[PDB]
Amino acid sequence: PSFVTFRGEPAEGFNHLVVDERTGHIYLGAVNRIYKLSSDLKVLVTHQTGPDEDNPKCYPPRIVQTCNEPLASTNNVNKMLLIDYKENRLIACGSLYQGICKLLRLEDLFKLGEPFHKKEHYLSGVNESGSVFGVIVSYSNFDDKLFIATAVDGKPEYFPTISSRKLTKNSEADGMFAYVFHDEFVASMIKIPSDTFTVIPDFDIYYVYGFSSGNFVYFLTLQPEMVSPPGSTTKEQVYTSKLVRLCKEDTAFNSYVEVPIGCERNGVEYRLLQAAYLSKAGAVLGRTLGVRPDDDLLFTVFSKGQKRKMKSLDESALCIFILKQINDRIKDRLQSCYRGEGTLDLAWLKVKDIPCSSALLTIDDNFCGLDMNAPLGVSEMVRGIPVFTEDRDRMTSVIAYVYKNHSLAFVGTKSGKLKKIRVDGPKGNALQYETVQVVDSGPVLRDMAFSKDHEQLYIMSERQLTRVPVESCGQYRSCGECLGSGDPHCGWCVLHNTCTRKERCERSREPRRFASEMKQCVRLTVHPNNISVSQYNVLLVLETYNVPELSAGVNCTFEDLSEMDGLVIGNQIQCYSPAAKEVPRIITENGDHHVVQLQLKSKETGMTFASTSFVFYNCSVHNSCLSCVESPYRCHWCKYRHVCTHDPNTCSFQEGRVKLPEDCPQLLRVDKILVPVEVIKPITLKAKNLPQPQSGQRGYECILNIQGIEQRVPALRFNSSSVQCQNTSYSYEGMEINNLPVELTVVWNGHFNIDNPAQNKVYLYKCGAMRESCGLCLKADPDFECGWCQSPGQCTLRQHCPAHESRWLELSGANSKCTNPRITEIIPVTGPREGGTKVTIRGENLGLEFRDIASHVKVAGVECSPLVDGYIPAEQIVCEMGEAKPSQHAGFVEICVAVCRPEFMARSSQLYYFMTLTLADLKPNRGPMSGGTQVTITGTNLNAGSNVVVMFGSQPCLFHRRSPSYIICNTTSSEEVLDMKVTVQVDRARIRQDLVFQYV
């Protein structure tokens, strides 16, 4: 939705706004223009007040007398605007005339009159807008007048800052703007003294806001540095914001009072008034405030500090004053002066301090002021009660009103936004909402008025007027959300199922028709929360609370899908579930269950207000016993029918029903099922609650899901808990993998698959696909019964290998030597003569125990000692060679399993070579002291032996890789010093040489 607005009809400018209480027409003061608009902000009429040839310096403007100074077309700013209902007109006081005032007719804006001739007719030279304010007060004839305050600009002789002036019936009449009582000695006006001007050059009083209360007139003002801040001579100007008051009845002007005003937040001072608004509290605020219904309140806005009235600070605070409290402060002050204590203390007015005179008097609120102890100031600054503070974006303006007793406050911001604040000190809370009806880039003005009907709030900007509704609750879809937002205007119109204000809800006055608090929402419950898909037209009872009288009629709508009529009895609603024809259309593809939001559609509104979680659950869809029972819902499984249903009767017969998950027909696990390929073997199974096949039903089968071949073997069900597939052999083609797990499915009557929770599988394993060597087979589990068969040179079960001889060989309990050891290949081919090398020998048919191999290994003559941890049985032996000093140079490797028997020994195909490695040169000769240099050691036979260590300066080098020609290592820090020697030690041999490494 967009907000209705009026763009600066003169796109050029804007200054003041006011609303006519009866009509709702909105009048807008502006520079060079005054507009009359409809409530909708349509342009009713435009008046041209503007550009006049003039000059501020000239006194009586050009029309009255000739001015030496040159004139220029200048803009006439609407300083003030006030509606005079009685007169049926508008006082629209401008400037640039020496401040001549104009009278515009209410309906047409016809200029009734604009008195220029006399001195009184001129208000002030001041060009600034809003620095002026005032009130129009009227009574029947022979009782009446206008109170207005304006800045002087140092014009003290020409104009009075505050005055009490006359407003005659005839706009033509000369008398206008004349002082109510003029005497040579005293006139109903207050001028600024010349002495005060000389002392402080710039002193001026700017009047922000003004209002009539009871029988007085108050003004919120800004003044200069006078004893504040202290200063010997002129320099900087800071302002003090004060409150002023007058009796309406005092022609003498004796009643004048002036108290400084502000408020502080946690040690932060807020001295400067931006705007104010007098209003009522309403029952809520008033009660906790402790006020009478009639008592008034004053919302205000202040900026931080005393500095720069022209351009104030962002920091701003909304404070509050109860009029009773201010009245007390004034009465308190007066009762004091009457005591005779102290001075009057009003710096700008009276330079020389006059003392207060004591006197006997009954000091009342009615007190209008007396001749002695005449106009007076105030010592104690009146503090206000803080409400909301904005640091980031300065508040510009404020308004407030009573709504259903709750007090709503409106606050303009520098940004062009409005805040809707419920004041709850007297209640309990804070800011409800913020809105940007206005103008996204830049600010709002003090003239912000609510409409007469109080539906909207016209918000004025420099550029445009915007009709911001005090309420747009419609945005809220649900009772939970509506009441959730908290912006006080919104309530849940239960029957309408919409969110709006009290006025908007038809028949909201009636009970439970309208909901204010979340508790009131609507709460709904359905007795049969869960209904099965199979059921149809089931009776449901609805319990609803906090709902208005439904006698209009109600319908139950499960969703957009269906709607059934309902009848009301007691405090309940009775509706029926949908038909089976209707229910499954929903259920399809949702499967297990579908929660649906059952709503209530009211007959009068026709909108769904209340909802509940309604479950459609259908047992039949479940394909298996586990899903049926084990699932989350109440469903029964029929073992025989093999169908899941809600009704017990539907099952085949009594013994057939499955209520509990344990009872489901399922296969229990046993020790792993091992199955050799090509062997005829039975496979016994255990299980529970296996059904006895009924008439027209076949027996059990075992189905193995092997990708290569799927086997169907019939089986026998011995009892409710045991099964067995008949003697058969299984195979898979490929010989790719030794152990292949296979899923097995037990079926009966052809299709019926018994549940397998564990998902037990059959392991098909093949006699040595994996083991070519006798040592490997005997190594494997004794369970397999797989063993080595000598004649074939292969390994299989006894069943599998023919017995020419009485025996096929099986490790009886490891007491089985395994023959013809062979050596495939060994690592480090070469080694150092000194020894210490770790030889890694890899063979096929070695000894099973370490103890036998130890002492077995020999390299030629040289004794080699094997390592236990390193040794992997019958596959590999890691052995460390001893001292090689012998004459051989190169020799074959021999392993004798236990004993060096002729059958029992193995010799290496290629011989182990012994060598004296030498090093010629280093790739980098030099490197930094810190080290970390990649050294390239070149030489011959560098690969020999087991261990290698490189030492530069006896400090170790970090080894990387080794080769026959090359050794690569990273240098250590030569903490020692520049230069150094290189020692390489392989095993017991330590070789050195002339090649040196130089540290740089």
Place this chain on the structure above:
Amino acid sequence: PSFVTFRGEPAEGFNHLVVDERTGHIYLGAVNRIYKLSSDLKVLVTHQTGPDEDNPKCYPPRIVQTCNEPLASTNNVNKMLLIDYKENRLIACGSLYQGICKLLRLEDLFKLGEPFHKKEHYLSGVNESGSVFGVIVSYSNFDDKLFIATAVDGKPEYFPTISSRKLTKNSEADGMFAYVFHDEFVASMIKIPSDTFTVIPDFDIYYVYGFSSGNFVYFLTLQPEMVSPPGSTTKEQVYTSKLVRLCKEDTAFNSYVEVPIGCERNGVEYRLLQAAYLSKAGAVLGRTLGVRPDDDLLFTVFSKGQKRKMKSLDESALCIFILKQINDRIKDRLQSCYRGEGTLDLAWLKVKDIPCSSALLTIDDNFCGLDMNAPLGVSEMVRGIPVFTEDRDRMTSVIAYVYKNHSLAFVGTKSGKLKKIRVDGPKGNALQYETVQVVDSGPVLRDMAFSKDHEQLYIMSERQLTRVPVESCGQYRSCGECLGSGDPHCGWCVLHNTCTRKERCERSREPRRFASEMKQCVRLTVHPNNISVSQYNVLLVLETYNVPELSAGVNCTFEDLSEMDGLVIGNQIQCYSPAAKEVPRIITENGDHHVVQLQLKSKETGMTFASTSFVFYNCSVHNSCLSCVESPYRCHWCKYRHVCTHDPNTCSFQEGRVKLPEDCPQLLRVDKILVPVEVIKPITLKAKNLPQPQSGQRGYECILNIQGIEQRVPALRFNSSSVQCQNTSYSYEGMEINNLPVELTVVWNGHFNIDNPAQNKVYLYKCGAMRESCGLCLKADPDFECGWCQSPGQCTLRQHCPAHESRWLELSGANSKCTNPRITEIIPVTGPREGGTKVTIRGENLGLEFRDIASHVKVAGVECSPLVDGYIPAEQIVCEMGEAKPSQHAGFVEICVAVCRPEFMARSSQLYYFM
């Protein structure tokens, strides 16, 4: 249009005229000529009757016997003319033959015969025309005759004045003009007795008019003084006009009767017949006259008094006689004689009075006369009913006729004009029209006859015959004029838009087609009389009365500008106004309003007959409030818009409307606005209904229109009735004139000038351009406040002169003595020594009061006394010098203002000289 006429074909002369009933041919008797003319007055044929060698004195003219007296070629005057239809000829009796008569053939004017031989063939020596008359009466054969009367000229033996004569079929026949019955004792003729001639030498009977009526023959005659007026011996002759009558049937001539006739108007006597005409009354006159249809009437014309038959008086009166009334007078007279009372009383005929004899008789109208109490006269003169009298221009002739029962009378005048008179004694009214068809300078003759068709009336003059239409209504342009003339023939042929007779108007019989009375002329009204310029095609209803059936079709034409079709319903016509496009073309430049004559154009004729005042009213043109409201029309002024408009709504707003003139905006006058040059002064003004300037409107200014410099000074409007220009000074360059009035215009909002009805002005005045002397300034009005300032030697306001001393001098109320008197010049330079001279001395700086100057003046030693009235203060002194007898001869003039102080005296530049 011009009237058809026949000029004296003989340009030389003219005498008688007659019209042939069947043909319409007009025969005209003249001297030496007889003409036959067409109805149109074209010349058909001319006959030469004229100049014959002859002599009046000779009896049987030269042809019969030789005459001793010398002959001379003389003119033959046509004495008489009579149409003999039966005979198919014209009897045209001449003179100069001893009055031989001629017979001219009807068609060709071929002379059938002219009997000269016998005595009867000679009628009378008398040369005068028109003194003769008579009638031709005819019947089938063996019944017939001619009755003719003529003057004798003292020829009593030769010719009979009245006779009954024979008219034979053959013009050649000898018998012609023989007496019907001739006996030795009595013949059908009446002669004048010789005795009567001796007594009165000149006696003669002149016969003016004659006509046959019923079965008688009447003659209107003029006779001499016989017992009237009484006179012992001959001297002067006056005439008595009488009526004569005879039975057609009386061969004996016993029936002769003779009554004097005349009429009187308010004690004025009209005795002499100029002409007469027998006619019918028609239904109108007859009814109120109380007559039968057949009964006749006799219109006549008489001059005042008994004097000069040869040249009668201008005063003349048209009288009337009903034949029944005259017949009664005659019967009454006869029944009386038969009573045996009195004498016959006929002076000229019977010198010795014979008595009437009584006898038993049934006296009827039929009575033809008897042997005893034979021809007789009459005592009681028969009076006639007067009709019209002309004092200035004498009536000469008359005719009358019946038209649609109204009786129209025609009367010739000495001037050559014809009057068309409806006689309405029996009806009610007088003379309708006068015409000069004839001859503008000089008169018309008795022979005036209407045509057979009665379309025209041939009017004869000495010089020319003129065909005057009875009717020539075409001359009249408008219904108002047509019916205005009153000559009864004319009516307004509405659709034709012309003026003519009933016969001439086609379809006049139909209703409202023809208008007889002015009332009938056309009256038109339009319901929406006033329509605004802004409006277009407005429905208008037309009310017309006295109009013929329009079903032919009608169009509405506002003027020559536009024309809109109309439809007829009821007794109204509905037309539409013109479009806005059309209406303003007219309105432009007429301004306030334009009255237009909306006419109706008839479809059949195509001429606009009826009109009305139609108003187009444009308010907008009015520039000011006064013109808008104060003017003559309904217009409203909008104070705020400052525009004038017809619609109230158009004004800015309700409070802004100006309906009344008082409410406007105008400047009221105050005592004259005096403005000194070079002085800062405010000028307060008074006024009424000054507007309060509305939004977007500026304030008031005072603009002075001074040719040298125009000043714009802003002002303040205190209230609806007062203004004031701000402190300023004004000047004009030139120093030419002291008092300069200047027009001032008060304006607001720049251009808007407030109305200034009085046209009040500001008087800019500047202190003595005119007065070099202290005496002159103090003399001037106290109002100016201008006064003499001693130190400067000049004169200006106090404001203008610095006060070293407490005073500048102003005549407080004339109590202010004034220095240095001078004498420019004095009049009478010279004077007599004796004195008494009035010396007029003109100077510059004299005394303010007379009392001081008196005794001041001296001419040298001689004391001179000044005159109060003559003395104009400080400018001039009029003084009278005393006795100069002193030795000086010449001396200088001296004036001492109050006292002859050394500073205070003035002496003349040039001296006064005594001689």
